[PDB]
Design a protein around this ligand. Structure first.
Ligand SMILES: CCCCCCSC[C@H](NC(=O)CC[C@H]([NH3+])C(=O)O)C(=O)NCC(=O)O
Ligand SMILES: CCCCCCSC[C@H](NC(=O)CC[C@H]([NH3+])C(=O)O)C(=O)NCC(=O)O
Lengths: 219, 221
């Protein structure tokens, strides 16, 4: 089983949980609880840049979110059929990571900047990101973003649509193709299982979880 | 068919690593320099930019926005992305650390002036204690001239571009890392990289206040 090293929170590990579960791959997590837990990994030389996420997979200790995502994606045939398809995939999911990063760090945003940061995020969802991905689906009329077959791009976009719904459920309302994609992807047997109660899917970060973050990661 | 065409302002910014990679692969490219917010809006109105931003690289009939999307395509196309998926994973792990450090150094100029000195000091601490030792450890683990697969890869190129920027920041930082210095020298001596480092190539200067002001105006920040 791949083994995911992170704390018990979404943070930078959640896109990897979604991808493994989507690919039908059982994984184990080793939850970090304290700074001491983190220091153990560093001391044991598990972490190339002293940071998590780290995924143990196939005798590698893969730190850096994208390094394990790319490797999981190629291994399980979710990175398209050739390097041109991979280029479209990487362009789509990097815009996804961009929006994703804004939402991810919103909890950590200095309190006097939170209002403006939220407003910006909602503005970009509506005017920049959602229109870009609706354009894609409209262009080809197909069920999947790339190559008319399931890829990473679909899973990462659907994960983002959940986080967008938690922010403001109206934001997707003018984007019918994005809504239909969320439904279709959420009904694929693996994703459906991941979305059910009691899965390893993680909740939004609350105040307690955030305080655990500051103690583990020393910030 | 056609040369790749790089769409960016006339500065390092987020395009310089791609400039580095293409010239290392021995690939001739054209640049189209955005000079104004009006230039950028024409790209947008024209439909050239998926998320209304640059870098954009026109290659092999695609208009690739997102730095990593064109870099990954270029690395794979010219056999600078390892020989298999496990090599690509060591490569990606390495270059993402490079990218995290590169980002810190890139955005340095846009820091509030009362934050600048502590940020500079954090950056230099991370170089000495986090990043340089990690890459020195890699070279020493195998003793080979390249980071991955004993064959030139994009990881050597991105790392050595990054060595050049740390040298501009503080030339002593690298001084306790002999294998990194050796790498810089060997990679700089590859025919293609040597030509790129010579006067008059596409290689871009450090960004001055004048260029940052052009950035503020063009990208509206
Ligand atoms: C809601 C915020 C989520 C929790 C904190 C951020 S993730 C933990 C942090 N890890 C990273 O920043 C890794 C970044 C790296 N670019 C990646 O994508 O893996 C860390 O180990 N920090 C310890 C350190 O840098 O020393
Ligand atoms: C210290 C100053 C450094 C200047 C760097 C700005 S790069 C220009 C900026 N582009 C991006 O942020 C693209 C980010 C994307 N993640 C990528 O890697 O390509 C842009 O088009 N912005 C316009 C927009 O987002 O509307």
């Amino acid at each position: 089983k791949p083994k995911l090293h992170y704390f018990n929170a979404r943070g930078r590990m959640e896109s990897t949980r979604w991808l493994l579960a989507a690919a039908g791959v059982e994984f184990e997590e080793k939850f970090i609880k304290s700074a001491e837990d983190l220091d153990k990994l560093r001391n044991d030389g598990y972490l190339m840049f002293q940071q998590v996420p780290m995924v143990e997979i196939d005798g590698m200790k893969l730190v850096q979110t994208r390094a394990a995502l790319n490797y999981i994606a190629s291994k399980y045939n979710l990175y398209g059929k050739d390097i041109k398809e991979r280029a479209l995939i990487d362009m789509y999911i990097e815009g996804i990571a961009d929006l994703g990063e804004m939402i991810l760090l919103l909890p950590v945003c200095p309190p006097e900047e939170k209002d403006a940061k939220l407003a910006l995020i909602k503005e970009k969802i509506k005017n920049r990101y959602f229109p870009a991905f609706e354009k894609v689906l409209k262009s080809h009329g197909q069920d999947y973003l790339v190559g008319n077959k399931l890829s990473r791009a679909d899973i990462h976009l659907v994960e983002l649509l959940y986080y967008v719904e938690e922010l403001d459920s109206s934001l997707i309302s003018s984007f019918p193709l994005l809504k239909a994609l969320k439904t279709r992807i959420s009904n694929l047997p693996t994703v459906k299982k991941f979305l059910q109660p009691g899965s390893p899917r993680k909740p939004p970060m609350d105040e307690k979880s955030l305080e655990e973050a500051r103690k583990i990661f020393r910030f």
